[PDB]
């Protein structure tokens, strides 16, 4: 019966430094602009194929696991378990949508470090994934792409989420979803890496819902991107001509709230929150 905390968690920062070192080995930029410095280097074309990473505890330490069906990530856990390593976590760098993550045991669970604070990001965990296929036409335009998913299935998701929102912010309220107000291309659109290429999918049909068959998302591939590891820009090599396909499960979302009504917009940017959605039941403790 110990106290858990996902926001001040140390494991999150542990794998964040791990993923950064991973991108420097496989996906190396050709040009890097940071702190008024122009850096150029080799830019090999290596395909990014995610593999489940199991984070274990070092010598003289242990990993505690909380088994609560509805644990908000902050407070004393009554069902604590001692494990050797965490579950296979698929390091998927993205925004707005959480891909290939872990689902909820019972029902949807919205988590936040401070619901009252509109600046704090809200992490949503679905209890049922929605498949989304993002492919890139074979050898028109090489930087053009698109994604497909079930319209009706995505409708239910929004509905179920809106129910949890009002269940926390009071019943007598109207929940409305609106696209990102602004910001970098990576934040305004659903961005992610697939086949070594950076996708920027337009997410206006997913986040334009009101209380009162499928969806095709137009996407594009860029070479100039705003680094997520740190502050600065980077330019990668030209896209490959081969077919690029990636079918992934939507297991969660990142929302951000700001005309007296409840308006929620797609969040993202800090990949730390992405790791939190998987390490909200774990914590490293030194053996006595």
């Amino acid at each position, epitope marked *: 019966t110990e106290n858990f905390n996902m926001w001040k968690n140390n494991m999150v920062e542990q794998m964040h430094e791990d993923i950064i070192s991973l991108w420097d080995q496989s996906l190396k930029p050709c040009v890097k602009l940071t702190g008024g410095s*122009v850096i150029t280097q080799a*830019c090999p074309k290596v395909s990014f194929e995610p593999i489940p990473i199991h984070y274990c505890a070092p010598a003289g330490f242990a990993i505690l696991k909380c088994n609560d069906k509805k644990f908000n990530g902050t407070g004393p856990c009554t069902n604590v378990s001692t494990v050797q390593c965490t579950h296979g976590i698929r390091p998927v760098v993205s925004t707005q949508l959480l891909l290939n993550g872990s689902l909820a045991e019972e029902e949807i669970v919205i988590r936040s470090e401070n619901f009252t604070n509109n600046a704090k990001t809200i992490i949503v965990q679905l209890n049922e994934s929605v498949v989304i296929n993002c492919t890139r036409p074979n050898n028109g335009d*090489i930087r053009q792409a698109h994604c497909n998913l079930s319209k009706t299935q995505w409708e239910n998701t929004l509905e179920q989420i809106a129910i949890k929102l009002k269940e926390q912010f009071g019943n007598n309220k109207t929940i409305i979803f609106n696209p990102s107000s602004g910001g970098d291309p990576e934040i305004v659109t659903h961005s992610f890496n697939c086949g070594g290429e950076f996708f920027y999918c337009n997410s206006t049909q997913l986040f334009t819902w009101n209380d009162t068959r499928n969806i095709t998302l137009p996407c594009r591939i860029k070479q100039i991107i705003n680094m997520w590891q740190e502050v600065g820009k980077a330019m*990668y090599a030209p896209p490959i001509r081969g077919q690029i396909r990636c079918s992934s499960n939507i297991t969660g979302l990142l929302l951000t709230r700001d005309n007296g009504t409840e308006i929620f917009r797609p969040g993202g940017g800090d990949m730390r929150d992405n790791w939190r959605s998987e390490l909200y039941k774990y914590k490293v403790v030194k053996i006595e």
Partner: antibody
Amino acid sequence: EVQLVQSGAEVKKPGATVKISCKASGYTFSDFYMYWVRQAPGKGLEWMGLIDPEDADTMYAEKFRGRVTITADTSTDTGYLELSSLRSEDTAVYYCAADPWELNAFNVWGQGTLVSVSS
Amino acid sequence: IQMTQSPSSVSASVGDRVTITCRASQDISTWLAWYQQKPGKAPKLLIYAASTLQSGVPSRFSGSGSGTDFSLTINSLQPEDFATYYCQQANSFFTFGGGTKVEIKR
């Protein structure tokens, strides 16, 4: 069908600012890169910078990195180049290039724009 | 980000085999393009990807190399092959080489 029409030649004073335009046609202007290159009489080709119109992402050569600016108006399908603090050394023919077939090379070229800088 | 092209000048007769090289300070894989320029005329692309030939360009033009060292060669030298050639970086930036002029030997 696919051609790049630049603006007429100009004349500037040592210290003024010049701005060149380049109208594209025959392809999706906002979906491709636009490149700029200048050549001084007697010398060789010199790359200046590039731009991705839809998001306005730019990359400038180290030499002009500080007094150059490349933009792209997707409303009229025209790219612009701006070089300030002009000197007698900036006298040359400036070209705007593109790559409609995406070959990673300058397949199409404008007629050029002679910019004469002198007191 | 720096391209060195040598020699700087070469003289040959009609029907000869000309070969120019191009060096890159940094490994740019196979992203190098070759151009042909004539006094007064705008540059015309010849070879891209450091091997692939342009549609319309004579077959007597061939290129090779990968990484940092490249080279351009011509099977036979025609009267309209005499000009200046440039090698260009094309992985991220597009820095040009110094260029090489092909003159007639007499």
